[PDB]
RNA sequence: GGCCAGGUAGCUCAGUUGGUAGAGCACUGGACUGAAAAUCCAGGUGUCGGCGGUUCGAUUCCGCCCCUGGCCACC
């Protein structure tokens, strides 16, 4: 309907940015970004009115958001900076060529891909490339972004882009960038499935040393990250109904050697979930004694008592130990599964003494 | 969109090792009154947001959503 409305208003609208990329990569997304030559607000209002849905205008931003079905539509007026601006002037202000393309929703040329900067070629060559030499200097956050994309899509940085990125980091612009945008970019990164590869890129270009104060790389943490990858793969394979957010575990491994103060402060800035904070605080202190107790575990009910109250994350962190692995597994796919029939339970019931008795019966069954 | 609280009677508010729920003022009924109010006895004051899952058993553990407030990211 957008093409028709644009025709009636004598305008030109374009699907723009990441949405295009994802499409060419065969990935379908529910968030669609439009750039309009002319007033975007009125186009959005008319689209919303014709579909009979609510509209959310932002006149100062010159953008409007509306939702149709599961589609989230964002309409933005073309602008030459973050006189009317051409679509090209709006595309050239973006980060990377693969993000810089556009698909025309205008009726005459409809479907046509618009690529000024050679983003389709870079998409075909698996290349991450900035539009201009000052790109990373303009928005240091992009330093992370590039890596993320390279991590996600298994692309590589251009020679020029790699040089410029390294130069940007060397200028210390990572410290000059707003803390919020960087932290948010990292939050975006840990949601990736290829997040470990991104972390590798982080290590290579040494961006973590700038963002997290006191943080340094070593081999133990790295190997712990890969072992964590193995465990995460296995758990997300067999136990997949029980899945949680995995990237946070990697993050905990990274800051594991950091001071509790800096760790707590970073997890504070990251706005981490409660179970992340709890798992961190448990890892920093009680995890050691817990492991030493698991070493002293003989009967299965002791393992039960020591494990069952814990969260999934703590167990996954416990699986990092070779000797404890098969034990944790045995607890998972065997030990904690059991039940009792009617008459028996009825005899067991004849307060908290019922619970204690049930515990006695369970430890009687196990051992 | 991410996260943090908050969700407890009509309203304003506490409650952790899961094990049979509470206060201050409205609610009914009767004793009391010519009627009413007060007061006494008392007792509703509640699937402790909604829906699934784990558990013998979930306000509690977890997952998906609703509502409100605040930190933000809103290229
Ligand atoms: N720092 C930046 N500099 C220039 N453009 C940026 C940018 N950050 C985001 N964008 C632009 O905004 C558009 C997409 O917006 P976003 O949704 O915020 C990032 P994305 O590429 O779609 O991946 P994402 O959906 O996982 O966040 C892209 O055209 C992209 O070039
Ligand atoms: Mg997006």
CA dist A126 to A16, A146, A195, Å? 20, 12, 18
CA of A107 to C1' of B6 (A): 51
Q: Which of A185, A130, A137 is nearest to A159 (CA)?
A: A130
State the DSSP H helix or E strand holding residue A113, giving kind and residue range, or none if neither: strand A113-114
A192 and A209 both lie in a single domain: yes
Give the dihedral sign, CA A205/A209/A211/A215: positive
- Of A98, A124, A150, at which residue does a domain stop? A124
Number of domains chain A contains: 2
Element (H, E) at A75: strand A71-77
Determine the Cα–Cα distance for residues A319 and A40; give it in Å rounded to an integer: 53
Q: Please check whether residues A333 and A218 belong to one and the same domain.
A: yes
Report the C-alpha gap between A231 and A334 in whole angstroms.
18
Beta-carbon contacts of A117 under 8 Å, excluding residues fewer than 6 positions away, are A91, A92, A97, A100, A131
- Cα–Cα distance measured from residue A174 to residue A321, given in angstroms and rounded to the nearest whole number: 36
Query: By what method was this entry solved?
Result: X-ray
Q: Is the CB of A354 under 7 A from strand B?
A: yes
Report d(CA A26, CA A224) in Å as an integer: 34
Clarify whether residues A63 and A168 are in a common domain: no
Do A248 and A162 reside in the same domain of the chain?
Answer: yes
Query: Alpha carbon of A115 to those of A104, A119, A151: distances in Å?
Result: 11, 6, 24
CATH of the domain at A197: 1.10.3090.10
In chain A, what is the greatest distance between 2 CA atoms, to the nearest angstrom?
85
| Structural domain harbouring A7 | 1-124
Residues A7 and A129 in one domain: no
For helices A322-330 and A286-295, give the axis angle rounded to 10 degrees. Answer: 80
Contact (Cβ atoms closer than 8 angstroms) between residue A158 and residue A165: no
Same structural domain, A138 and A117: no
Question: Which window residues (237-266, chain A) lie with Cβ within 7 Å of strand B?
Answer: 244
Contacts of A241 (CB under 8 A, 6+ apart): none
Give the CA-to-C1' distance from A191 to B33 in angstroms.
Answer: 73
* Boundary (domain end) residue, out of A124, A159, A190: A124
- Judge if the beta carbon of A93 is closer than 7 A to nucleic acid strand B: yes
Among A17, A58, A66, A16, which Cα is nearest to A39's? A58
Residue A262 and residue A212 in contact, taking contact as beta carbons nearer than 8 Å: yes
Q: Is the CB of A146 under 6 A from ligand 1?
A: no
A39 and A149 inside one domain: no
- Among chain A residues 42 through 81, which have CB within 7 angstroms of nucleic chain B? 61, 63
DSSP run (H or E) holding A76: strand A71-77
C-alpha to C-alpha distance for A366 and A364, rounded to whole angstroms: 6
Among A124, A159, A180, residue at a domain's last position: A124
H or E stretch at A306: helix A300-307
A10 touches strand B (CB under 7 A): no
Same domain as A40, residue A136: no
Query: Tokens standing for A217?
Result: 């790389």
Question: Domain holding A82: CATH number?
Answer: 3.30.460.10
**Judgement on whether residues A129 and A263 belong to the same structural domain of the protein:** yes
- Same domain for A117 and A131, yes or no, is no
Buried-state track A157-176, b at ≥16 Cβ within 10 A, e below 16: bbeebbebbbebbeeebbee
Could you check: is the Cβ of residue A192 within 7 Å of any atom of nucleic acid strand B? no
CA A274 to chain centre: 17
Q: Answer yes or no: do A95 and A134 share one domain.
A: no
Whether residue A342 is found in the same domain as residue A280:
yes
Q: C-alpha distances in angstroms, A355 versus A164, A305, A358? A: 65, 14, 5
């Amino acid at each position: 309907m957008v093409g028709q409305i644009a025709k009636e208003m004598g305008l030109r609208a374009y699907i723009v940015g990441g949405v295009v990329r994802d499409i060419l990569l065969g990935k379908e997304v529910w968030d669609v970004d439009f750039v309009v030559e002319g007033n975007a607000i009125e186009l959005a209002k008319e689209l919303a009115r014709r579909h009979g849905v609510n509209v959310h205008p932002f006149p100062e931003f010159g953008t409007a958001h509306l939702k149709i079905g599961k589609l989230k539509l964002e309409f933005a007026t073309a602008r030459r900076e973050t006189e009317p601006a051409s679509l090209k002037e709006d595309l050239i202000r973006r980060d990377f060529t693969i993000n810089a393309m556009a698909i025309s929703v205008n009726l005459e040329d409809y479907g046509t891909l618009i690529d000024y900067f050679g983003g389709l070629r870079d998409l075909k060559d698996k290349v991450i490339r900035v539009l201009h030499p000052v790109s990373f200097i303009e928005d240091p956050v992009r330093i992370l972004r590039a890596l993320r994309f390279a991590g996600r899509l298994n692309f590589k940085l251009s020679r020029s882009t790699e040089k410029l990125l390294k130069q940007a980091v060397n200028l210390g612009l990572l410290k000059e960038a707003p803390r919020g945008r960087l932290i948010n970019e990292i939050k975006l990164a840990l949601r990736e499935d290829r997040f470990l590869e991104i972390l590798e890129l982080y290590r290579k270009y040494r961006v973590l040393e700038e963002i997290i104060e006191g943080f340094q790389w070593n081999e133990k943490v790295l190997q712990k990250l890969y072992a964590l990858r193995k465990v995460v793969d296995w758990h997300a394979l067999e136990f997949s109904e029980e899945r949680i957010d995995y990237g946070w575990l990697y993050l905990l491994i990274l800051i594991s050697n950091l001071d509790y103060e800096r760790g707590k402060h970073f997890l504070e800035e990251m706005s981490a979930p409660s179970w992340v904070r709890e798992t961190y605080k448990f890892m920093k202190f009680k995890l050691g004694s817990l492991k030493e107790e698991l070493k002293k575990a003989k009967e299965n009910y002791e393992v039960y008592r020591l494990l069952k109250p814990l969260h999934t994350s703590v167990l996954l962190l416990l699986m990092l130990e070779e000797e404890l692995k098969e034990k944790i597994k045995l607890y998972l796919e065997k030990l904690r599964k059991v039940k009792l029939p009617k008459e028996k339970i009825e005899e067991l019931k004849k307060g908290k003494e019922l619970g204690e008795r049930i515990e006695e019966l369970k430890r009687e069954i196990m051992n």
